[PDB]
Design a binder for these strands. Structure first.
Ligand SMILES: [Zn+2]
Ligand SMILES: [Zn+2]
Ligand SMILES: [Zn+2]
Ligand SMILES: [Zn+2]
Lengths: 190, 620, 586
RNA sequence: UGACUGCUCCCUAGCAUGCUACUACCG
RNA sequence: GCGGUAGUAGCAUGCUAGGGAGCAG
């Protein structure tokens, strides 16, 4: 803002004109002073305006390109995360029972609702009350979905271990009742 | 219609996505390559490749939204809390979610009490609170889908009601738009499951460039992509103590539904003077204009309003299909015949019957609407118009034609029967005639399952126009609900507007020289919003003074009410605003030394700033 | 799109577009590289090309920035701004640059199309990242050159040791032996199908591979060109002689595999690297085997440069070290699978640098330094980050298949950075004990390059033969033939009964194929055939030109045979240097 | 853990247009 | 003598972008 190309000419002309004015010369030198300084300031005006426009344009361009780079970095990391999640969840497919039921299909297509029903290794049961409990998972082994399951653990709504010896009719009102029962496939998968 | 009836015989485990095994660089996957609908039969994908190299970004997005892998890599689940079908459990624990109470603003309550409020025997009292819920509330609320039953329809009458509804939806334009013309507001909201583990919608709208979005949108015109919906509990003020739940749809569904429907949705919300009043505001004389439009030139005017019990849990599937088909009728040039069917199949597989994730488990949604998709309110309006039209048809066709004095109405009834049960193709002249008859004798104003009707009264008494009983019968035999007439009103004096529309009452006041209609809310709602807040930082008024300015804007028209406490609410709000401002200025000048000025701040505690919001002169 | 520039290490966003490897260039460096060189393309988060519709300019010094896009002189708006100004290109982090003065040598590296000796002189004469960039671009240009070849159109097969195979039109016959591996992939209907890892013998096509497939229709034999990944670690890590033996545990007893192996450990236990300077059959094999049990509680890695040279890599390891302590790494081509594959926890892993299970160690051994480039040193230093390691190999061996250079031979000083590192300051180790060899190789290679630090262990009976025959050379194709070999094999087996079961060094593999077709001798590769030599070998004439005979191709060829080393004087060899027995042909 | 729409108020930044003003150039 | 043009300052108007908040279905 102080070393512009026209600054040298403008300042030198102003200094010379004002020295001539301080010399106390005639009115012709004053008119020449006025004209020269007017045109000098007029030419300095656009040189002082266009540069300021250009700097702000350049700054906006820099900011936009920086934010584009940040967006690309975020895209790369989200792609890596999705790939990792897929390849991690792949490793639990039990690729022998799944293959055994896929090959029985006449064209390779099977409903999705029967894959956990015939290939899962673990079963989870949520029981509202004792009357429902004694009709579904009474004892230590029960049958569901044409398979045999054996109990492995029982917890309550607070996630604390509960032993089957205290799930009775008298002791029912002393438990956080949304009980969760975990079982394993017997003779088949786990 | 026939598929709906025939699908009730076959086992329920043979419906849904169909999966198979594909190979990517020698490793086996499990992906969905089709669907088996209860209504649309068997649908197979068109672009499926078994052997492929390393996959791209949009393939990752598609494979990460499919429920196939999540269901196949999870444990079996047998849930006895509900009677809906259960698929699998994604973890080893069950999640129980509670709802917390509200926060008490003691300063406002003390200020209100010190001014003669909340006395015994008063007509203004608090009945809006924050209710708390226990652990097993989300599943208990989800178990209300048991009211959705398979319903067969009268096809020869639905095929005419749909024509009349399409006549109603005729003044708009629509079609498909490119990915660079989509307008999204608030990109800082959730993206659904499983996309909420890595960021909000901003991350996925920035990481995806324009031709990626275009390719993804063009992918769903030849394939079906099933997704997963997450259920969340609301934390808001209310007057009843039942839990409220909304549905969070996945990003892959919203991103394409916007490109499919946004042009028509924006064209609907920009028209004034139509039947659907979505987009019209109530400030600057909007309410008066809407009320004058709905009155039209009916001859013996009465007013009527009704209510839908369990509107979204009990709406049959066929009406949702009809609403989607009616909305998708603007694509006669931009889309082919197979593209439209595949778009319909995608919509059905994503927002009508899909896997929902409640707690930490996957369930099967029987039917109904999932409030939270990209086209909720407009579909609700289409459904409301359809129900009104069939109620009118049933009212007219079930009248002894030997006692109709007017011969024009008798000929109209004869032609209606002929066009329903003796004509196989559309007859446009009679559709236009019936539409004109309905618009002359039965005027409606619809906003997403809320409606006000101005109808001819002598015609309704003689049975030539629908009544409340007709709505009750239609709801009973077509919606599987009972509509008690204790939630419906009727007004025989037009100088007092509708008894209730969008939770607002109507009063006819004199402003300027003429008389206009103004809406006012329930005072208890305003006071409850004042006294009970979510967040702790809103129990310090000086930090947020702009809350009370908006609350006083909402409560202005209460000063014209003949009852006296109603105006006292507005005056109390103004005095509290002034007290808060004085507190801020003095409380800041004291310990610090910053001196505050009261330039153009006194406008907020004088009535002229608020009076200008209900006077017809558009501003800003 | 964001990283450090190869000279100032400052953050940049500009990629040069005229260099095949697209390096990261600093803004001042970008200006210097674009001004003093005809590299006039620059890439950023968006390309620096004119975006005016219908226009096509790809300069950088010609464009003007206007609005949000980039424009040229013919489409600059009234609000324009030149990108190339102030001697500094417009990009991110433009105010946090420092510049550099090493731009002339960087320009030479970038501009060098790899033609003459000075190419490798300046490749080995620069700073670290320039060495890495030069090695990367050298492998890039050689792999592009070899992928600029046709596809072997095959539709039928005669039998084993026979083949009809056709190249493309306008494409010449590719190089012959396993030094240029033939691994192709055919198609059945929709994708590619397996063919086999093979190599061709002559033009009759015998199979020197290691499998047999039902080869016929639609077969595509190709010299598979592989995409080169960028380097991470430098070619070598500067060593510092330790005082503590951290992790290393000299056992209470002495596992006396070899005697001087104690000194081996004594000076390899403190410096960050070492090297096994081994003449052929002079302890180049099992000093690491002794180290295996003297330092049994130290994670020890073994590697080589080619899948062919795994003989001593794999034999004594299972022969004498415990079974479980060994481990195998093989991609799944055909090689020794003697140890266990798919095992991450072990103390003795044996493999090549092709593919390893990423881990770090504290002791490594690395074989075949002669045909090893700085790229291989960098990749072994990146995959394995250890505390000490040894590079087995000797300068008195063969260079890598650097067919790129044609004018000047690549001498010991130009093998790689380490191979001259031990040349200038001296080798880390120097042995002088030949395991089983008469003193012929002693005299020869000790007068030539061994400086006579090893002397006569086995007696010199002077049964080896060298004659006065010269030979005549004739070129036909990229392989040549020798009439004074088609006749000379017979003329040299006329009555001498000792070299009938000798091995045939192959400066020209086609000549060896013809010799096998006519008389019949085993084919012996030149570069990747160390340790496969038998007790008895013939060094044949096979050439007179600068193909093989300056110094360093026969330094190991003189050691192929043990007692009967028939090394006839072929061409301008080291004739008047020693004593050799001779018999004159009739 | 926080869905889809619609309307309204407040604060800051930029752009466009208009009004007035102060110098200077030109006829 | 009048007008045009070039900067500079204050004021007003409508859009776009960002942030905070309120109501309704
Ligand atoms: Zn369309
Ligand atoms: Zn370059
Ligand atoms: Zn630099
Ligand atoms: Zn151009």
């Amino acid at each position: 803002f102080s070393s512009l190309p026209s600054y040298a000419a403008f300042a030198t002309a102003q200094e010379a004109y004002e020295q001539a004015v301080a010399n106390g010369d005639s009115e012709v030198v004053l008119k020449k002073l006025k004209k020269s300084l007017n045109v000098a300031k007029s030419e300095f005006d656009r040189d002082a305006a266009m540069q300021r426009k250009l700097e702000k344009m350049a700054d906006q361009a820099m900011t936009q390109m920086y934010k584009q780079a940040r967006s690309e970095d975020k895209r790369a990391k989200v792609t890596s995360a999705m790939q990792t999640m897929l390849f991690t969840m792949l490793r639990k497919l039990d690729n022998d029972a799944l293959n055994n039921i896929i090959n029985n299909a006449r064209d390779g297509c099977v409903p999705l609702n029967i894959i956990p029903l015939t290939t899962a290794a673990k079963l989870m049961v949520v029981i509202p009350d004792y009357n429902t409990y004694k009709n579904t998972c009474d004892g230590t082994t029960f049958t569901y979905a044409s398979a045999l399951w054996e109990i492995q653990q029982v917890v309550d709504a607070d996630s604390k271990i509960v032993q089957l010896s205290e799930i009775s009719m008298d002791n029912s009102p002393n438990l956080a009742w949304p009980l969760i029962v975990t079982a394993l496939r017997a003779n088949s998968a786990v | 219609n026939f598929n709906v009836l025939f699908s009730t015989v076959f086992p329920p485990t043979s419906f849904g996505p169909l999966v198979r095994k594909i190979f990517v660089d020698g490793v086996p996957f499990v992906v969905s390559t089709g669907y088996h609908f209860r209504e649309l039969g068997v649908v197979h994908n068109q672009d499926v490749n078994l052997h492929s190299s390393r996959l791209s970004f949009k393939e990752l997005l598609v494979y990460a939204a499919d429920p196939a892998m999540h269901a196949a890599s999870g444990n079996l689940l047998l849930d006895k809390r509900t009677t809906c079908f259960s698929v699998a459990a994604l973890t080893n624990n069950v999640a129980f979610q509670t709802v917390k109470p509200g926060n008490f603003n003691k300063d406002f309550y003390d200020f209100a009490v010190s001014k003669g409020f909340f006395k015994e025997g008063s007509s203004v009292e608090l009945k809006h609170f924050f209710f708390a819920q226990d652990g097993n509330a989300a599943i208990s609320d989800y178990d209300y889908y048991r009211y959705n039953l398979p319903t067969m329809c009268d096809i020869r009458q639905l095929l005419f009601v749909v024509e009349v509804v399409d006549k109603y939806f005729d003044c708009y334009d629509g079609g498909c738009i490119n990915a660079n013309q989509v307008i999204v507001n608030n990109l800082d909201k959730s993206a659904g499951f499983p996309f909420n583990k890595w960021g909000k919608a901003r991350l996925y709208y920035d990481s995806m460039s324009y031709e990626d979005q275009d390719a993804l949108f063009a992918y769903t015109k030849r394939n079906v992509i099933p997704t997963i919906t997450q259920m969340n509990l609301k934390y808001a003020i209310s007057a009843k103590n039942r839990a409220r739940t909304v549905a969070g749809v996945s990003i892959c569904s919203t991103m394409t539904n916007r490109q499919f429907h946004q042009k028509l949705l924006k064209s609907i919300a920009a028209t004034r003077g139509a039947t659907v009043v979505i987009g019209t505001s109530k400030f600057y004389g909007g309410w008066h204009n809407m009320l004058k439009t709905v009155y039209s030139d009916v001859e013996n005017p009465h007013l009527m309003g009704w209510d839908y019990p369990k509107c979204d849990r009990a709406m049959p599937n066929m009406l949702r299909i009809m609403a989607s088909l009616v909305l998708a009728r603007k694509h006669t040039t931009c889309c082919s015949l197979s593209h439209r069917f595949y778009r319909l199949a995608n919509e059905c597989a994503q927002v009508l019957s899909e896997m929902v994730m409640c707690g930490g488990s996957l369930y099967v949604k029987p039917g109904g609407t999932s409030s939270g998709d990209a086209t909720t309110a407009y579909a609700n309006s289409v459904f409301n118009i359809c129900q009104a039209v069939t109620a009118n048809v049933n009212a007219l066709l079930s009248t002894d034609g030997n006692k109709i004095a007017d011969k024009y109405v008798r000929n109209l009834q004869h032609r209606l029967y002929e066009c329903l049960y003796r004509n196989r193709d559309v007859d446009t002249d009679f559709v236009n005639e019936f539409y004109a008859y309905l618009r002359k004798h039965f005027s409606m104003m619809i906003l997403s399952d809320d409606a006000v009707v101005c109808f001819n009264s002598t015609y309704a008494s003689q049975g030539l126009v629908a009544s409340i009983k007709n709505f009750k019968s239609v709801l009973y035999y077509q919606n599987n609900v009972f509509m008690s007439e204790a939630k419906c009103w009727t007004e025989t004096d037009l100088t007092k507007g509708p008894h209730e529309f969008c939770s607002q009452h109507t009063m006819l006041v004199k402003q300027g020289d003429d008389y206009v209609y103004l809406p006012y809310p329930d005072p208890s709602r305003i006071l409850g919003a004042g006294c009970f807040v979510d967040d702790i930082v809103k129990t310090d008024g000086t930090l947020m003074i702009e809350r009370f300015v908006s609350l006083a804007i909402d409560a202005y028209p209460l000063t014209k009410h003949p009852n006296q406490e109603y105006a006292d609410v507005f005056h109390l709000y103004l005095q509290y605003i002034r007290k808060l401002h004085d507190e801020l200025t003095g409380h800041m000048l004291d310990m610090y030394s910053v001196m505050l000025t009261n330039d153009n701040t006194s406008r907020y505690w004088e009535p002229e700033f608020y009076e200008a919001m209900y006077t017809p002169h558009t501003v800003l | 799109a964001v990283g450090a520039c190869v000279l100032c290490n400052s953050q940049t966003s500009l990629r040069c577009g005229a260099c095949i490897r697209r390096p990261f260039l600093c803004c001042k460096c970008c200006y210097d590289h674009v001004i003093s060189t005809s590299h006039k393309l620059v890439l950023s988060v968006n390309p620096y090309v004119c975006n005016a519709p219908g226009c096509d300019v790809t300069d950088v010094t010609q464009l003007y920035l206007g609005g949000m896009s980039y424009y040229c002189k013919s489409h600059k708006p009234p609000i324009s701004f030149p990108l190339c100004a102030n001697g500094q290109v417009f990009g991110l982090y433009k105010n946090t640059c420092v510049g550099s003065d090493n731009v002339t040598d960087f320009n030479a590296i970038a501009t060098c199309d790899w033609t003459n000796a000075g190419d490798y002189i300046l490749a080995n004469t620069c700073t670290e990242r320039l060495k890495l960039f030069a090695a990367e671009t050298l492998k890039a240009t050689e792999e592009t050159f070899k992928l600029s070849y046709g596809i072997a159109t095959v539709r039928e097969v005669l039998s084993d040791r026979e083949l009809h195979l056709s190249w493309e039109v306008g494409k010449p016959r590719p190089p012959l032996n396993r030094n240029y591996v033939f691994t192709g992939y055919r198609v059945t209907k929709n994708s590619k199908v397996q063919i086999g890892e093979y190599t061709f013998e002559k033009g009759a096509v015998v199979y020197r591979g290691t499998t047999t497939y039902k080869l016929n229709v639609g077969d595509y034999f190709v010299l598979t060109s592989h995409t080169v990944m960028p380097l991470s670690a430098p070619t070598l890590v500067p060593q510092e002689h330790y005082v503590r033996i951290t992790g290393l545990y000299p056992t209470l007893n002495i596992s006396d595999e070899f005697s001087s192996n104690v000194a081996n450990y004594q000076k390899v236990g403190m410096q960050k690297y070492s090297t096994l300077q081994g003449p052929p059959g002079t302890g180049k094999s099992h000093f690491a085997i002794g180290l295996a049990l003297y330092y049994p509680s130290a994670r020890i890695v073994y590697t080589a440069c080619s899948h062919a040279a795994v003989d001593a890599l794999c034999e004594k390891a299972l022969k004498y070290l415990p079974i479980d302590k060994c481990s195998r790494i093989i991609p799944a081509v055909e090689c020794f699978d003697k140890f266990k594959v798919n095992s991450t926890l072990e103390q003795y892993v044996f493999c090549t640098v092709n593919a390893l299970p990423e881990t770090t160690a504290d002791i490594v051994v690395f074989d075949e330094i002669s045909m090893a480039t700085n790229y291989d040193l960098s990749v072994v230093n990146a995959r394995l980050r250890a505390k000490h390691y040894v590079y087995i190999g000797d300068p008195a061996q063969l260079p890598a298949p650097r067919t790129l250079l044609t004018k000047g031979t690549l001498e010991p000083e130009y093998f790689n950075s380490v191979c001259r590192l031990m040349k200038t300051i001296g080798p880390d180790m120097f042995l002088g004990t030949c395991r089983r060899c008469p003193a012929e190789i002693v005299d020869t290679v000790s007068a030539l390059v061994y400086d006579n630090k090893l002397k006569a262990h086995k007696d010199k009976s002077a049964q080896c033969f060298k004659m006065f025959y010269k030979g005549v050379i004739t070129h036909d194709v990229s392989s040549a033939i020798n009439r004074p070999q088609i006749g000379v094999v017979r003329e040299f087996l006329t009555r001498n009964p000792a070299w009938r079961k000798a091995v045939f060094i192959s400066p020209y593999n086609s000549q060896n194929a013809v010799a096998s077709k006519i008389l019949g001798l085993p084919t012996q590769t030149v570069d990747s055939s160390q340790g496969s030599e038998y007790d008895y070998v013939i060094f044949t004439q096979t050439t007179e030109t600068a193909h093989s005979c300056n110094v360093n191709r026969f330094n190991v060829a003189i050691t192929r045979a043990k007692v009967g080393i028939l090394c006839i004087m072929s061409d301008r060899d080291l004739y008047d240097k020693l004593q050799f027995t001779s018999l004159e042909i009739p």
